[PDB]
Each structure stands twice: as C-alpha cells, then as structure tokens.
Design a protein around this ligand. Structure first.
Ligand SMILES: *[C@@H]1O[C@H](CO[C@@H]2O[C@@H](C)[C@@H](O)[C@@H](O)[C@@H]2O)[C@@H](O[C@@H]2O[C@H](CO)[C@@H](O)[C@H](O)[C@H]2NC(C)=O)[C@H](O)[C@H]1NC(C)=O
Ligand SMILES: *[C@H]1O[C@H](CO)[C@@H](O)[C@H](O)[C@@H]1O
Ligand SMILES: *[C@H]1O[C@H](CO)[C@@H](O)[C@H](O)[C@@H]1O
Ligand SMILES: [Ca+2]
Ligand SMILES: [Ca+2]
Ligand SMILES: [Ca+2]
Ligand SMILES: [Ca+2]
Ligand SMILES: [Ca+2]
Ligand SMILES: [Ca+2]
Ligand SMILES: [Ca+2]
Ligand SMILES: [Ca+2]
Ligand SMILES: [Ca+2]
Length: 424
C-alpha cells in the first residue's frame, strides 16, 4: 500500500508519486499488463499516466472542501495489473496550508452590561471560525487595550476557541454609556515539508452598551432654603422652584416632589407643591399677625425601584404689611364739664393700639375741629383730652370731640372715635 503526500492547492500537473517505480514495474511492460485505475477509486483530483506510471494532480485540491475540519485527509486510489491479476492500494495524504483567516459571523458585536455588574463577571462573545486545521486554525483572541475589560479564552476542540469578556473594574453609565473596542482573532501560522506559513487575522467591532441602574439619589443643592414673602401674598404666588437632580435614566431618573409627613397641618393648608415640577407656591392667606414663619418639609424621590428619598426644608418668612388700622379705646368720659373750668381741666382718657409691627403699628393722634380742647400724653399711646381756655354754656353748649388715630405705614390707615361733652 503506497503512501504519498500532496499540498492542497497545487496546480494541475504537479508530481504526486511514481507508482511504477515504487512498485518495481518496468514501464515497458505496463501496456501489456493492462495497468489501469480501478473504476470505483477514480477521482477528479488525480491523473495517472498509464505509459509512465506517474501520478499527477489533476483538479486543484481544496482540503477545506473535501475534508472540512477533519484532522486527517486521505485520497484513496487503487490500481491493478492483469495477467496475473494484482491489485494495489494508494493512499494520498492532503496536507493543509494556511489559506484561510479566522472569521467572525458578523462584523459588529454588541454586548449589554448592567452598570452594577461585579468585576470578575464574564460576558461571552461570538467566536470566530477558521476553516483550516491544526496549528493553522484559530489560536487566540485580542482586544483593544483598555482598563475595563480583558479576555478569557478556552479550548472547545476541533480547532475551535471560545472567548468571554472579563469585567476588570466597575462601569458607570452616568460617566460613559457606550464602550467601543476592536476584537481580533489570529490563527497559529507562524511540518511534513511545507513552506513557511504566515499568520492570518480576523476582526470584529465590539460595542458595550451600559445599562442603567438606579444608583443615584435625587439631590437638592442645599438642605435648607429660605424665602421671604409679603403677608397677604395672593394664592398662586411662587415660593420657590425646587430642583432635586437625578442623572439616572428613565423612571430611575424621573423625580416627584411631595410633603414630608412631619409637615405642620397649617403649612399643609397654606402651601401647595407640584409633584412633577417641584414648584412650591402659596395656596392660603399668609398672615404675619398669625405667624412670621412657616416650615415646609419637602421630599423628592425618583420613580425607579429601590428609590431612596431625599429631603429639604423651606423656611418661608412672612413680611408684615399694614393691614390693621389703629384701635381707639376710651377709658373715661365726663359728659359734663363745669362752666368756669380753668384751662387744663381733664375731660376724657383713652388709648390706642395697632395689631401691626414697627412703623405699621406706630400711631399718631389728632383732635379734629376748631374746638377749645387740647390733647396731652403722659405715656406712649395713652392720651388725655383737656380744656384750653374758659367756656360758655349758651354760646357753646355741647361739644362733639372726635379723635383720629393714624398709623405710619404705606398706605397709612386711620380710625376715628367721637365723644359728647357738654357745659353744665
Ligand atoms: C434643574 O437642574 C438641571 C440641571 O442643572 C445642572 O446640573 C445640576 C447637577 C447643577 O449642577 C446645575 O447647576 C447644573 O446647571 C437643569 O437642566 C440643565 O440646565 C443647564 C443650565 O442650567 C443646561 O445647560 C442643561 O442642558 C440642562 N439639562 C437638562 C437635562 O435639563 C434644569 O433646568 C433645572 N430645572 C429648573 C426648574 O431650574
Ligand atoms: C493578522 O493581523 C494581526 C494584526 O491585526 C497580526 O498581529 C497577525 O500577525 C496577522 O498578521
Ligand atoms: C481585521 O481588521 C482590523 C482593522 O482594525 C485589522 O487590524 C486586522 O488585522 C484584520 O484585518
Ligand atoms: Ca483550501
Ligand atoms: Ca487550508
Ligand atoms: Ca487559518
Ligand atoms: Ca452609575
Ligand atoms: Ca435615581
Ligand atoms: Ca444609573
Ligand atoms: Ca395680617
Ligand atoms: Ca400686618
Ligand atoms: Ca397698622
């Protein structure tokens, strides 16, 4: 049983083996003996010269086609002579050359990884396939140098190899949502009398899409905000536009605002908070004389799973306006004054109050008319009405004295009160 070898991809007419010689047959007797190829073992890849006994390549041999990824490739030829009958078997071994690169099944790979994946986690890649065999097949994978991912490769047999990405450090979608790298696969070309083989290489783009986790908590730029507003500010008045930022994606990053449970029942009445905009506004009557300040406790919380609430406090200081007029109150009024009352004779006592504060609560007083009475004051806001001259029971019998109390706000407010006095 003769044994020959032939490189795949040799051109037509290449020498394969001298069958006549290696069997001891003189070429001069070949024709007489009916030197011929057995019918079943004919192959389009081999020509046998029957006059010389020499085997030549006929059609070029592609090992990948006849033998796929088999580790061994052997064409079986059989020849025979007649008179006597003699049958000879011939095995022709086809040697693989490195005429194919590793190849990926698609030019762009995409791998999706949660930004909360732990370092050490592995993500499989689509493997490249190299149709050559043995050392000419796939040998290793490589990735663009980078600090986030390395490669792990293992043997699958039949010259195949499988790679995974190995996560080397945490990802942060909020810092970079997509990583792009170049993936490469090289075979092992670089042995039964073969000429030098060169290494071949295949390529694929690799896209890492980083999936969002709800790992950012909404954030107010301050823990307390202070706002001053005039009392009687009308409903709808803006207090403050809160903003609790959240860089996450989707519902993870959508923030809704509401009142914390610690909020006073009065603040809940007087203020209203837009759940989606964070707009805080007045919805009731702010009355300084009721309270100069309110504490609004707000919470913000995103709409994702495992959301964590954030908190801030709005201090609403109320500013006093001049919305109360002075109050006059008489404590004693002698309706009758004697005719000859000397000047300075006291006729009435009274006091004034104003529910406002500062200038808005400061009161000045005047006596109206051209009557012969004068105002005196011993202490702030306490007054007396005295006479100023002698009198007359008939010319001036009864007198109406009216006091006007005026505060010092803008616009000012004033009040009046009258008393009836008569000469005995
Ligand atoms: C609420 O704030 C956002 C974001 O503001 C930026 O990021 C914060 C962390 C903080 O550092 C701010 O000072 C930053 O300006 C506002 O939206 C952004 O506004 C900036 C300019 O103000 C603009 O350049 C960006 O493109 C905006 N981006 C987005 C996604 O909106 C937003 O307008 C604020 N809302 C209100 C009601 O004030
Ligand atoms: C294929 O190409 C790679 C580079 O992309 C080489 O490293 C390799 O030797 C082969 O030439
Ligand atoms: C695939 O394509 C890349 C281009 O980035 C080469 O480096 C590689 O050798 C193969 O040709
Ligand atoms: Ca081939
Ligand atoms: Ca080959
Ligand atoms: Ca190859
Ligand atoms: Ca993150
Ligand atoms: Ca969030
Ligand atoms: Ca996130
Ligand atoms: Ca008031
Ligand atoms: Ca007031
Ligand atoms: Ca007042």
């Amino acid at each position: 049983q003769l044994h020959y070898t032939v490189q795949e991809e040799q051109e037509h007419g290449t020498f394969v083996g001298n069958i006549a010689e290696d069997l001891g047959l003189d070429i001069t007797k070949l024709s007489a003996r009916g030197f011929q190829t057995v019918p079943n073992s004919r192959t389009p890849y081999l020509d046998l010269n029957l006059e010389t006994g020499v085997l030549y390549v006929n059609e070029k041999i592609d090992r990948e086609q006849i033998c796929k990824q088999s580790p061994s490739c052997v064409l079986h030829l059989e020849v025979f002579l007649e008179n006597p009958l003699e049958l000879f078997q011939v095995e022709i071994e086809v040697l693989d050359i490195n005429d194919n690169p590793p190849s990926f099944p698609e030019p762009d790979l995409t791998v999706e990884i949660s930004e909360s994946a732990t370092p050490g986690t592995r993500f499989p890649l689509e493997s490249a396939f190299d149709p050559d065999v043995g050392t000419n097949s796939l040998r290793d994978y490589e990735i663009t140098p980078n600090s986030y991912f390395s490669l792990d490769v293992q043997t699958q047999g039949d010259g195949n190899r499988f790679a995974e990405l190995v996560l080397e450090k945490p990802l942060d979608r909020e810092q970079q949502a997509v990583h792009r790298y170049v993936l490469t696969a090289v075979d092992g070309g670089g042995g039964a009398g073969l000429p030098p083989q060169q290494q071949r290489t295949g390529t694929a783009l690799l896209t890492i899409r980083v999936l969002d986790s709800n790992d950012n908590v909404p954030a107010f730029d301050q823990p307390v905000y202070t706002v001053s507003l005039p009392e009687n500010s009308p409903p709808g008045t803006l207090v403050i536009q809160l903003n609790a930022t959240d860089p996450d994606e989707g519902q993870n990053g959508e923030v809704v605002y509401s009142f914390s449970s610690h909020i006073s029942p009065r603040a809940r009445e007087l203020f209203g908070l837009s759940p989606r905009t964070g707009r805080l506004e007045v919805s009731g009557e702010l009355d300084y004389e009721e309270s100069p300040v309110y504490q609004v406790y707000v919470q913000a919380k995103d709409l994702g799973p495992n959301a964590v609430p954030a908190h801030c406090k709005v201090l609403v200081r109320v500013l006093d306006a001049n919305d109360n007029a002075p109050e006059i109150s008489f404590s004693t009024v002698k309706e009758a004054v004697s005719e000859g009352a000397a000047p300075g004779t006291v006729v009435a006592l009274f006091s004034v109050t104003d529910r406002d504060s500062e200038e808005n609560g400061q009161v000045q007083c005047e006596l109206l008319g051209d009557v012969p009475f004068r105002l005196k004051s011993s202490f702030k806001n306490y007054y007396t009405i005295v006479t100023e001259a002698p009198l007359d029971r008939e010319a001036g019998d009864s007198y109406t004295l009216t006091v006007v109390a005026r505060d010092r706000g803008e616009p000012a407010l004033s009040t009046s009160k009258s008393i009836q006095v008569q000469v005995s």
